From a paper:
GTP tubulin is known to assume a curved conformation in solution and a straight conformation when integrated in the MT lattice. Here, we modified our original method for the preparation of human α1β3 tubulin to purify Drosophila α1β1 tubulin. We first determined the crystal structure of Drosophila WT tubulin within T2R, a complex composed of two tubulin heterodimers and one stathmin-like domain of the RB3 protein.
Upon GTP binding, the interaction of residue D177 in the T5 loop with residue Y222 from the H7 helix is broken, and thus the “out” conformation is favored. With the T5 loop in “out” conformation, the negatively charged residue D177 in β-tubulin is exposed toward the solvent, likely mediating the incoming tubulin dimer having positive charges on the α-tubulin interface (in particular, from K336 and K352) to establish a longitudinal contact. The dimers and sub-critical oligomers of variable sizes and curvatures are in quasi-equilibrium in tubulin solution. The GTP-dependent extension of the T5 loop mediates the establishment of longitudinal interdimer contacts and stabilizes them, giving rise to a subpopulation of nearly straight oligomers (highlighted in yellow in Fig. 2 G).
Numbering used by the authors:
A (entry chain E): 4 to 34, 44 to 145
B (entry chain A): 1 to 38, 43 to 438
C (entry chain B): 1 to 278, 281 to 432
D (entry chain C): 1 to 38, 45 to 440
E (entry chain D): 1 to 278, 283 to 431
Write the structure that this text describes.
């Protein structure tokens, strides 16, 4: 049966009041930002975002440099292959030339020695003949 | 004059704004083109609508989104002549469900433009009360852009009230896995800048649409029309010459005993299907009893597990004080209704004579009398606990955190936001101890 | 978040890409000449995501067609929708990559890559709001794999803030074109781990097995394999092309699907499984069940061998949204042991009224499952069997590559497997 | 576009070139005068075009004696080649590697290189060189080695692939052919990328068994060799369903630089008589490739392991039928692969059926296939050759003929030690992994 | 490798040389005036190997005719085909070497050698691509043996890179009574071992034995012996004279036949054996390869092993049958071939048979059994040299005894080298 009704306000399209069933056990109701602060925090976040985008691009730049180093390495290997094939072949053709000329000279010197022996035979025949009877 | 500026942020905020402003137009007799053949009777509608040199009435509102699709529907739809193009503001790319993207990356490029528009609306006010901000906790814009805007609004309008209508995330209609992160992050940054926040859990409204309106799979159009009904009930005494919650400061006075515990529970009745066969009108006793039923709440939580620190009954329509007092007397007789020891057990009651209005062709039946209860109960801490637990499960593994860190946020901000919500949970416990 | 720029590289990339353009053109009511002749507004609402509007109401795919060899280009131009493509968007070399990742990535591919970037730059600069890039390619050859990954890193450098998405075809000895596929695939996975945001793993092992075991095709062809891929790609892109709330753009999809940056490899699923000559039913409970069926996965992994970190489920056709919601809740509750408990509400569902070309009802699952580690282990075992003996290595080192790149790619792929295993074993009670 | 330069060296290389270029002309509709009436323009890889519309082979024919090349110069196709691409000296290498490489070859090598340089100048996308020669002749062995070395200096690592005739006693012209074969293999090993060996005894026996020819002549052997060469080059000269270029042959067939000798197998080989031959399916012609009687080199693949198999199909062949045939081959226990090869199959398909020379021994078939397989069984051919070398070299028999030309005995030891290492390389490569 | 320059020295050399020119002229369709009246294009395809084309379509043998005696020239000019030879190519002295190798090599022969080189240089320099030289001579007299070997070393000095080939007639006590034939033959073998690339050993002992035992000629003459030589020479030069794959030139033949530089002495074989007044099957022809009765060197091929063999089949016969029979003859007789020279038997088939026959077989064998021919000469040499008999015939011409000991040692070393390879195993 206990209910304290208290009229609050009355107006053109409304009416208000407070209904109190029981008063409180404990008497009494007990038991700034700045543009600069905001801006400083937003700009610090922007710098972290830009720093990580820069790190991503720095790594992509490192991949582009590596790509250039593999193209260069393949070019250098092809050039060293050419250089080695060229001097191996020049060495082989020159050794072969020295050898073939040496074999030809040795066999011609053998035939030339036969000619020296032949004139020496001719010499003895001549003194056997003539200087007789 | 007591003008209020409405700020609709992101998809949820903008789509709820479409529903609210459509209902206000119907309630004040304003046509979609801004014309008014002056129904209502009084000129209090001027708190929410300014007037142009051609006799048109224009909402004191700003619609903002980081993407243009949703606001483009407002720019080209039924109410395109109701708003001037300068109050419909959009960027090109959204916040991709990421608070850090909305707060630190994309929001930063449109915030000055939004503040400039708000300043031009404030210049047309002789007695600016403050702001009503509509947004979701879950979206990247609703979370990140709203908190960024709240901070600047505190710098530019220190002694002005800021009231929120916030959408609490629900898996049935959820758009992102990271919604618990966005919710805890935005609550942390907004806590000290907001004066009073009316949370609406999509699951509670979704279940009310299924149970009370017989809608199998409710859409955002169904949910928002019901949200509009609740928002209209809460703003009715600012837009009509009412007697309770006559100014925005009165909301903090009547519902908020401590600055951090500013999340009142909303309950609404009756919610009846338009397609229902000619039913008899519900009495003041029946709609009052429905106020004390968990199934009619805007947030899923158990008031039996908590204590009330303030209670406001906003009746609307064919309602007489004698019938209200008789209804409240029976409820105290059969129910406990435990109040904290430092607050009196009782209610602040308001009757707004203007009838409840429904959108023609909508899902809601036109009723002779309705009631909206706003109660600050410690039981709402259950919604924070559910959200905090989901945050903890993911954050223990640092799941999805790289998305926020990649936008310039630090891990410490996640710890700070979570520690602040742990303090909020302890505050509800301490405040409701005796 | 409007435009997507599509790139197709190499034979496989251009074959599945032409098939993607042919299916989505039919769904959007676009004929072989680029003319719109549909009867629904949902078909044109988001047409600009994939098509440019040219003079005279014609729609032209925002697609760049790439190869180091011209034969593929000729076959696409000659194909059913070949005339729809922008002629200047066909970028091709004359040499070929010789099935060698190193030629595609460092030598011949590097010589053609700037001609490709000039064409994708023209498409990108024309965008009002570029979402990012979509690449179709195989990982087993030289062009799609080597040059495709070279393109990704070059695009990452010029568009670091855009989403990079791939449809990557994983090789299988069951339907193989070259002996060095495990090398080309491992070197590409290494690149994808570091430079893509979302990768759909389209496994030829899984496609061959669906055709052989389920469709009863004794000898499956690329046509049979590509029919499953085209339905899958139509399914995974549904939310990018039609009006809807969930995963409507490449970044919102990435935020919902990718909890850890390196774990961005998706296991696509599709139901019903059909052949090009096709049953006549499939109900909502039947469609939801296929989410855990290894037989319905486009990656040769068993979803019941691991746990789903995240899932996107797309249902298409005339079906009850209420029934889909009830069945998706039941499939999660009954199979709680196959979802990580520390990512709450990790399954997101979408329903679209327009079914894929040729079907009345369908389901597509985009899964981020720890079971994908089985696909990487399979590639790794094939890689090690060759690398242990240094077989075919002189073809890569002859292109300037070092042996260290192989060991690094192998380590990164094994670390990825070890990461998936770590989250598979992780409990909520740390 | 993707040009291939052909070099035909010595009697065997030149006579096989006569058969190949005659067959290419028949396959592309090129008349003996180089004219072609009024498409697939891939033949441009092997034929250049003059201002008068005449198609000219991208080829050089070289011999140290003029007799064999004189037949080209005065025959049916004398207008097809310009006289400057048919190069001959006066005196041959007398079955001596040393005379081909040094004494006689060094006099004409600069002229041959000058002509190849003029052909390379007409190439916009030179793929490399196809060198046709015997292992046994003094020119085929010695001049080819010298030319290979000079091509590595002028073109670096540009692809160099061979078609080499392995010696057979039935048609052998010299006792010293094992010496000429070992010396040329040693010199050429590091300069060649891939060598397709053809054993004359195997082609001789195929002509006797499959074509019913009592005593096969070089005309019979060469027409069959031309068929195999045409099959290997059909993927370069036509654009079929699946193509394989010079680079793809190398990458798929050569796992290690020295292991570059694929075995050639061809099917079907049917006599122009019979008539009741009933058309052989893709499965039947594929199965025939793994039958020893169809191999171009005498060796037993059952005694070895496959490391790579390239299938070159031509005619009425569909990819589905090829995959079905290769799948049954993968289930054959008697066809063993090395454990370090997960899959060793490269397939190429061309629509153009095998064209036969009018009045030849071969029947017109609807479909044919040429398999290029890297098998460790091919080491049997090297062992056979190495043993004959050892028998003679232990006594220094015939060595004075090479020494007299400037060669040293140390070159014989080095060449033999290199071939001993090659034999051990086939043994190591066929071993299972630990 | 086109032109061959032929030289014939002394009586024997000019008698077998005139016979060679008469047989190959008939085979190539060339009459006694040098006119071509053949029927086949195979006859003229390689006509330039042995003949020059003179004014008016006539063919003239690239032959130089040499003798220290001027009667041999007259008899050749008077013989059948005498008018075919170039008149200025007849180079003759007046003295005669008196069956003395020293007179031929050092005295009278040295006085005539420059007149011969005048004529062979003119022939050799006129060649487009000179293969080398072919010499017919005997080893038992003075001109053919002494002057013939002097010519070889002089031509070798001027043309060191050309092939030097000889048809060397070995003496026998059965046909000639000249006592010093063992000396002239040993001094010539010494020269041939060091300066020729290929030498066909035409043994008068073997020729006499075929005529006496097989042809039943009680008293054979040089005409009877030379008929076997002309058929043999037509047979061994078949591959130089007609289009073909095998041993088509003097250097390719040497490379196939000569495994060791000194072992270049060939044992020629021929089937069928005919007289000047008298067709075998393929198996019958192949069997004669191991028949001592068919050898033109008095050695038994079954007494040694073949290092290398060239088998030439002529006439209309099956190449398939020849191939089958040649494989059977080496499989059944594997012990008579050295195992360490694989595929050492090369076969050739020519459609044109020799003059007077329908089918023939010629075998060019490099057999270790040839050491029996050298041992026979060596025993005859030692029987005389041991007593220094007739030495003043050679020392009177300026020679030293040391040249004899050296020639003897070199010939015994040659025998010892054939024996070494005969006994050698593959092991
Ligand atoms: N699902 C499909 N896989 C394909 C198709 N074509 C090829 N592939 C697979 O792709 C892999 C390599 O084939 P490609 O033709 O794409 C090689 P690509 O052109 O990119 O480079 P190159 O090696 O330079 O030729 C291998 O695993 C094949 O089985 C196709 O149409 N569908
Ligand atoms: N088979 C042949 N052997 C012959 C012929 N003429 C001679 N001879 C043999 O040659 C040897 C004697 O040589 P020659 O008569 O040629 C002596 P040549 O003229 O060369 O020198 P000189 O008479 O000493 O001046 C001796 O063994 C004879 O039996 C012949 O026509 N055929
Ligand atoms: N009641 C209601 N909730 C909505 C509506 N639209 C979205 N939501 C909810 O809001 C959350 C998602 O936030 P949104 O407002 O769509 O996102 P946003 O603010 O536009 O942010 P971004 O799109 O990320 O830039 C989810 O919980 C949705 O269920 C709406 O019209 N009504
Ligand atoms: N298949 C085939 N093999 C041949 C042909 N001609 C020769 N040969 C073989 O090649 C080898 C001999 O080499 P050739 O090519 O004739 O000699 P060459 O290269 O001309 O060298 P030289 O004549 O010594 O300067 C033997 O094994 C012959 O059987 C031919 O037309 N076809
Ligand atoms: Mg939004
Ligand atoms: Mg390709
Ligand atoms: Mg030759
Ligand atoms: Mg005389």
């Amino acid at each position: 049966a206990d209910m304290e009704v208290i009229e609050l306000n009355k107006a053109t399209s409304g009416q208000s009041w407070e209904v109190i069933l029981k008063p409180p056990s404990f008497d009494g109701v007990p038991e700034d930002p700045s543009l600069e602060e905001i801006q400083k925090k937003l700009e610090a976040a922007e710098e972290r975002r830009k720093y990580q985008e820069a790190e991503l691009l720095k790594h992509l730049a490192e991949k582009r440099e590596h790509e250039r180093e593999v193209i260069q390495k393949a070019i250098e290997e092809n050039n060293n292959f050419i250089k080695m094939a060229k001097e191996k072949l020049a060495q082989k053709m020159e050794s072969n030339k020295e050898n073939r000329e040496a074999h030809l000279a040795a066999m011609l010197e053998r035939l030339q020695e036969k000619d020296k022996h032949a004139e020496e035979v001719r010499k003895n025949k001549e003194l056997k003949e003539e200087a007789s009877r | 004059m007591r003008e209020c500026i409405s700020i609709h942020v992101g998809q949820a905020g903008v789509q709820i704004g479409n529903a609210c402003w459509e209902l206000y137009c119907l309630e004040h007799g304003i046509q979609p083109d801004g014309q008014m053949p002056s129904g209502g009777g009084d000129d209090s509608f001027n708190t929410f609508f300014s007037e142009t040199g051609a006799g048109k009435h224009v909402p004191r509102a700003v619609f903002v989104d980081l993407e243009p699709t949703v606001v483009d529907e407002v720019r080209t739809g039924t109410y395109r002549q109701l708003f001037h193009p300068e109050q419909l503001i959009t960027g090109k790319e959204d916040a991709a469900n990421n608070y850090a993207r909305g707060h630190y990356t994309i929001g930063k490029e449109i915030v000055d433009l939004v503040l400039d528009r708000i300043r031009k609306l404030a210049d047309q006010c002789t007695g600016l009360q403050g702001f009503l901000i509509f947004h979701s906790f879950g979206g990247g814009t609703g979370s990140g852009f709203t908190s960024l805007l709240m901070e600047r609004l505190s710098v530019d309008y220190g002694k002005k009230s800021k009231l929120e209508f916030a959408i609490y995330p629900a898996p049935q209609v959820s758009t992102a896995v990271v919604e618990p992160y966005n919710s805890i992050l935005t609550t942390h940054t907004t806590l000290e800048h907001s004066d009073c926040a009316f949370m609406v859990d999509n699951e509670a409204i979704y279940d009310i649409c299924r149970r009370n309106l017989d809608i199998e799979r409710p859409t955002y159009t169904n949910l928002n029309r019901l949200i509009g009904q609740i928002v209209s009930s809460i703003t009715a005494s600012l837009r009509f010459d009412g007697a309770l919650n006559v100014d925005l400061t009165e909301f903090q006075t009547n519902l908020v005993p401590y600055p951090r515990i500013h999340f009142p529970l909303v309950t609404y009745a009756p919610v009846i299907s338009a397609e229902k066969a000619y039913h008899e009108q519900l009495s003041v006793a029946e709609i009052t009893n429905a106020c004390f039923e968990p199934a009619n709440q805007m947030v899923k939580c158990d008031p039996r597990h908590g204590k009330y620190m303030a209670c406001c009954m906003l009746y609307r329509g064919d309602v007489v004080p004698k019938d209200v007092n008789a209804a409240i007397a029976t409820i105290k007789t059969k129910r406990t209704i435990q109040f904290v020891d430092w607050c009196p057990t009782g209610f602040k009651v308001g009757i707004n004579y203007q009838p409840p209005t429904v959108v023609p062709g909508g899902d809601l039946a036109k009723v002779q009398r309705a009631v909206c209860m706003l109660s600050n109960t410690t039981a709402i801490a259950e919604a924070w606990a559910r959200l905090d637990h989901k945050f903890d499960l993911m954050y223990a593994k640092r799941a999805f955190v790289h998305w926020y860190v990649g936008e310039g946020m630090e891990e410490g901000e996640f710890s700070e936001a979570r520690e602040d919500l742990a303090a909020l949970e302890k505050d509800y416990e301490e405040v409701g101890m005796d | 978040m409007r435009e997507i720029v599509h790139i197709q590289a190499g034979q496989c990339g251009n074959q599945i890409g032409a098939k993607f353009w042919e299916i989505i053109s039919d769904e959007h009511g676009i004929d072989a000449t680029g003319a719109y002749h549909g009867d629904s507004d949902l078909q044109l609402e988001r047409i600009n995501v994939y098509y440019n509007e040219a003079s005279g109401g014609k729609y032209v795919p925002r697609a760049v067609l790439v190869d180091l060899e011209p034969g593929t280009m000729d076959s696409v131009r000659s194909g059913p929708f070949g005339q729809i493509f922008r002629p200047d968007n066909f970028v091709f070399g004359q040499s070929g990559a010789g099935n060698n990742w190193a030629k595609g990535h460092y030598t011949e591919g590097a010589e053609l890559v700037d001609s490709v970037l000039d064409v994708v730059r023209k498409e990108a600069e024309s965008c009002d709001c570029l979402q990012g890039f979509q690449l179709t390619h195989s990982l087993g050859g030289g062009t799609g794999s080597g040059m495709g990954t070279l393109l990704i890193s070059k695009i990452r450098e010029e568009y670091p803030d855009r989403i990079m998405n791939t449809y990557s075809v994983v090789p299988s000895p069951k339907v193989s074109d070259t002996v060095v596929e495990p090398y080309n695939a491992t070197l590409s996975v290494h690149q994808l781990v570091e430079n893509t945001d979302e990768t759909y793993c389209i496994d030829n092992e899984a496609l061959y097995d669906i055709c052989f075991r389920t469709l009863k095709l004794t000898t499956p062809t690329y046509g049979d394999l590509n029919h499953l891929v085209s339905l899958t790609m139509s399914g995974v892109t549904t939310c990018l092309r039609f009006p809807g709330q969930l995963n409507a753009d490449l970044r919102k999809l990435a935020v919902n699907m990718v909890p850890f940056p390196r774990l961005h490899f998706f296991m696509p699923g599709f139901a019903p499984l059909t052949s090009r000559g096709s049953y006549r039913a499939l109900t909502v409970p039947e469609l939801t069940q296929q989410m855990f069926d290894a037989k319905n996965m486009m990656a040769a992994c068993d979803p019941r061998h691991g746990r789903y970190l995240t899932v996107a489920a797309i249902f298409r056709g005339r079906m009850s949204m209420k029934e889909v919601d009830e069945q998706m809740l039941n499939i999660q509750n009954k199979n709680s042991s196959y979802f990580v408990e520390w990512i709450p509400n990790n399954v997101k569902t979408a329903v679209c009224d327009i079914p894929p070309r040729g079907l009345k009802m369908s389901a597509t699952f985009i899964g981020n499952s720890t079971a994908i580690q089985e696909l990487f282990k399979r590639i790794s075992e094939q890689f090690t069997a060759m690398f242990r003996r240094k077989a075919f290595l002189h073809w890569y080192t002859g292109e300037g590559m070092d042996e260290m790149e192989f060991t690094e790619a192998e380590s990164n792929m094994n670390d990825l497997v070890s990461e998936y295993q770590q989250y598979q074993e992780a409990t909520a009670d740390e």
